[PDB]
From Swiss-Prot:
Official protein name in the record: Guanine-N7 methyltransferase nsp14
Residues given in the record as Mg(2+) 1 binding sites: 67, 134
Organism: Severe acute respiratory syndrome coronavirus 2 (2019-nCoV)
Whole-protein coverage range: 5949 to 6449 of 7096
Positions of Zn(2+) 14 binding: 150, 153, 169, 172
Designated gene of the protein: rep
UniProt subunit comment: Interacts (via N-terminus) with DDX1. Interacts with nsp10.
């Protein structure tokens, strides 16, 4: 049952205002036929245009909300809206384009999807709140058939060209006019009461209804993300490597070890309260400190309230004001003044970070993590952590071409001595690259106000 059976029933109540008289009893087989597509009984990788909620969740990077509003249905113009903010007007003769015939509109659709998706996914998933016109408009820009490969590479085909009779992936589709073998999901099939806006607005205040098709497309995709990644969570689903995932994750582990080790050396905290991932390991295994762990799964809806994290019911809590607290990707409303924090900035633009629900973002790196909206007021008791590199390892090369390093932030015995050694220069430069990688991916670092790297120099005596 990996794919959605074409013989599964499709509820048609949402379709009956654009398509009055539509049968209540309807399969995806008959719906696709009504839409003008012929599947011809084919076992060539495309069994159904529509997919299950589970298949959609695995292909969240391909999600594009899509809505169509009958501007005036063959005799009248249609407004095509996408979750990219684009509105196109197709004449039968928040970016708003003037009315144009389908032969030119379809070229723009292929260009927009290709630029949006080439670095995200091998396909497109149109996320719908289906009322009828969107389904009947698909024949004007979509072609279907057997699964194919690109004419210029090994990737699966996503576009077709009537000018050359060739197929292309999102990277090689310049000049292509048809979307080929797209997928789609109707959010209305999941069991909702009331219209799109009333359901969307229950969970999100960031997407207004500016009464255009793209606004509905944005709300539809937002509602879908809420249902699949906010109220329901699945960290076992794996997602392919599309960018700097491995380098980012490795940089995160390096930065965490560096920052925590320096905080412990600089302020000599007797206890560290590590709050977050129930599977966390000590990031500084050699530290003398009393290491205490507290379990909190990643919050996907609202940031944790610090009052609830330290609420111990009918028993006394641990002394959280003693020592230091470590919140490594544990999103809280207001960090305590004695903290070391790594907080993902949801506003960051990247191929790993997708738009989410209520200001939040869906960060997809190995697993999908819906993250609550970044809020500067969470850090009022802390300061931004400045870049620095610290090392107590011996000054010896072991085993690249050199230019001598001069830097006030290379905290080593050799720099204290007046001249940074080759080993520490190489490690400083590698660390700086890892640091820049993590920051540019969207992570932000915050620390208790008394943190001072000047206190690290006396660890070399
Ligand atoms: C610093 N945090 C804590 O000590 C606690 C947090 N929760 C939820 C507790 C439950 C029972 C006992 C202690 C705690
Ligand atoms: Zn290609
Ligand atoms: Zn929304
Ligand atoms: Zn050195």
């Amino acid at each position: 049952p990996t794919h959605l059976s074409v013989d599964t029933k499709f509820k048609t109540e949402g379709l009956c205002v654009d398509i009055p008289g539509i049968p209540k009893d309807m399969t995806y087989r008959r719906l696709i036929s009504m839409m003008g597509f012929k599947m011809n009984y084919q076992v060539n990788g495309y069994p159904n245009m529509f997919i299950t909620r589970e298949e959609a969740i695995r292909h969240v990077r391909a999600w594009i909300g899509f809505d169509v509003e009958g501007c005036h249905g063959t005799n009248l113009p249609l407004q095509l809206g996408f979750s990219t903010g684009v509105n196109l007007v197709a004449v039968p003769t928040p970016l708003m384009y003037k009315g144009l015939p389908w032969n030119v509109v379809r070229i723009k659709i292929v260009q927009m999807l290709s630029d949006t998706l080439k670095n995200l996914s091998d396909r497109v998933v149109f996320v719908l709140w289906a009322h009828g016109f969107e389904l009947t408009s698909m024949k004007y820009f979509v072609k279907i058939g057997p699964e194919r490969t690109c004419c210029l590479c090994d990737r699966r085909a996503t576009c077709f060209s009537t000018a050359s009779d060739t197929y292309a992936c999102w990277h090689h589709s310049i000049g292509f006019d048809y979307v080929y073998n797209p997928f789609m999901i109707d959010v209305q099939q999941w069991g909702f009461t009331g219209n799109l806006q009333s359901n969307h607005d229950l969970y999100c205040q960031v997407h207004g209804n500016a009464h255009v098709a793209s606004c509905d497309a944005i709300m539809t995709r937002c509602l879908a993300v809420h249902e699949c990644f906010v109220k329901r969570v699945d960290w076992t689903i794996e997602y392919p490597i599309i960018g700097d995932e491995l380098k980012i994750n490795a940089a995160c582990r390096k930065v965490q070890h560096m920052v925590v080790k320096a905080a412990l050396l600089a302020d000599k905290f007797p206890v560290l309260h590590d709050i977050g991932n129930p599977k966390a390991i000590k990031c500084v295994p050699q530290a003398d400190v009393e290491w205490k762990f507290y379990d909190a799964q990643p919050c996907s809806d609202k940031a944790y309230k610090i009052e609830e994290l330290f609420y111990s019911y009918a028993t006394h809590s641990d002394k959280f004001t003693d020592g230091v607290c470590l919140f490594w990707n544990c999103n809280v409303d207001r960090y305590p003044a004695n903290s070391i924090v790594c907080r993902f900035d949801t506003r960051v633009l990247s191929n790993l970070n997708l738009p989410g629900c209520d200001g939040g973002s869906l960060y997809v790196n190995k697993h999908a993590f819906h993250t609550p909206a970044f809020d500067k007021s969470a850090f009022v008791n802390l300061k931004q952590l400045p870049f620095f590199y610290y090392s107590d390892s011996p000054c010896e090369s072991h085993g690249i071409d050199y230019v001598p390093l001069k830097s006030a932030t290379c905290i080593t015995r050799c720099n204290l001595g007046g001249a940074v050694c080759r080993h520490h220069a190489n490690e400083y430069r590698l660390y700086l690259d890892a640091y820049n990688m993590m920051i540019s991916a969207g992570f932000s670092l915050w620390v208790y106000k008394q943190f001072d790297t000047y206190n690290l120099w006396n660890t070399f005596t």
